[PDB]
Amino acid sequence: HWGYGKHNGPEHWHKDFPIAKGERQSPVDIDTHTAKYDPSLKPLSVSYDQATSLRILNNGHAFNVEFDDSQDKAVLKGGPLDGTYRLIQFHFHWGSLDGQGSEHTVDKKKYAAELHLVHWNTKYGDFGKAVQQPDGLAVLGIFLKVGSAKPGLQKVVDVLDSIKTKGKSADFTNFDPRGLLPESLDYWTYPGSLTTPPLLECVTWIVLKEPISVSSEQVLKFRKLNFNGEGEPEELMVDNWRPAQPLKNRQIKASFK
Numbered sequence: 001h002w003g004y005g006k007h008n009g010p011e012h013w014h015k016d017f018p019i020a021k022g023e024r025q026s027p028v029d030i031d032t033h034t035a036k037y038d039p040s041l042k043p044l045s046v047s048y049d050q051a052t053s054l055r056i057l058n059n060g061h062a063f064n065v066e067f068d069d070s071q072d073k074a075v076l077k078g079g080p081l082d083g084t085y086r087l088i089q090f091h092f093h094w095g096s097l098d099g100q101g102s103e104h105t106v107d108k109k110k111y112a113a114e115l116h117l118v119h120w121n122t123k124y125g126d127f128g129k130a131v132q133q134p135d136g137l138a139v140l141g142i143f144l145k146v147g148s149a150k151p152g153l154q155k156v157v158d159v160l161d162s163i164k165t166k167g168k169s170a171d172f173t174n175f176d177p178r179g180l181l182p183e184s185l186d187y188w189t190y191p192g193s194l195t196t197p198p199l200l201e202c203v204t205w206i207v208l209k210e211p212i213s214v215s216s217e218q219v220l221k222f223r224k225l226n227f228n229g230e231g232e233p234e235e236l237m238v239d240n241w242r243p244a245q246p247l248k249n250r251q252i253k254a255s256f257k
């Protein structure tokens, strides 16, 4: 089944997941001149001080850092959101080259990678119930460009050797995701979807305007990961991004003038 190759990639997904051609699919191009400032947007609240990371996993599509979401330890509130959304995991999408890798684009510009911090709406009790709801998830998206190193990313980078292939995991406790944020929390927001199968239309997207910088050495280590399992022919984990989808009947709102 699905992946990012020529024969199982994004242009094939609709055959197993017809919602791929739905009315609120992600990612999208963010046209900065068409996005409208919305003064009704409340300030974004990112409360990660009590975040409890557990594990990092290569699942054959990306690497995922998982959190304890059995209590309100790390939460996202405010902005366009009603209620409390619990951090469950984060992951990245990245390219084979610095000129591509992000899922969202900004005036058609592609960044080298994109970080997704996934949160679920606690009024639905668990993640599996939340993805069945139009306001079930809030994903915080952060662009990566190549320049100076991101110190808060390095602990992630240095563990990747231990999870090279699909199915491998490692202990990843006491990681502080606050070290992955840019200075500004200015954002764009729109209603959208998961960007991987099952492509469910359950996400409030919050995409930060300010990218973070990571070093060429850091993103090079992303690209040494493997889509395949151990003892299988090596396929480098690169270009695990879905391209921009039609905006259709949606307006992207900006938190800033």
Ligand SMILES: COC(=O)[C@@H]1C[C@@H](OS(N)(=O)=O)CN1S(=O)(=O)[C@@H]1O[C@@H](COC(C)=O)[C@@H](O)[C@@H](O)[C@H]1O
Pocket: 059, 061, 062, 088, 089, 091, 116, 118, 127, 139, 193, 194, 195, 196, 197, 198, 199
């Ligand atoms: C809690 O886990 C999740 O939310 C993942 C990531 C999230 O991606 S994103 N691009 O839309 O923010 C999708 N879901 S998911 O539907 O639960 C999760 O994701 C997939 C791949 O996703 C990645 C990035 O590796 C699959 O393997 C899949 O079986 C799904 O259950």
Ligand SMILES: [Zn+2]
Pocket: 091, 092, 093, 116, 195
């Ligand atoms: Zn993602």
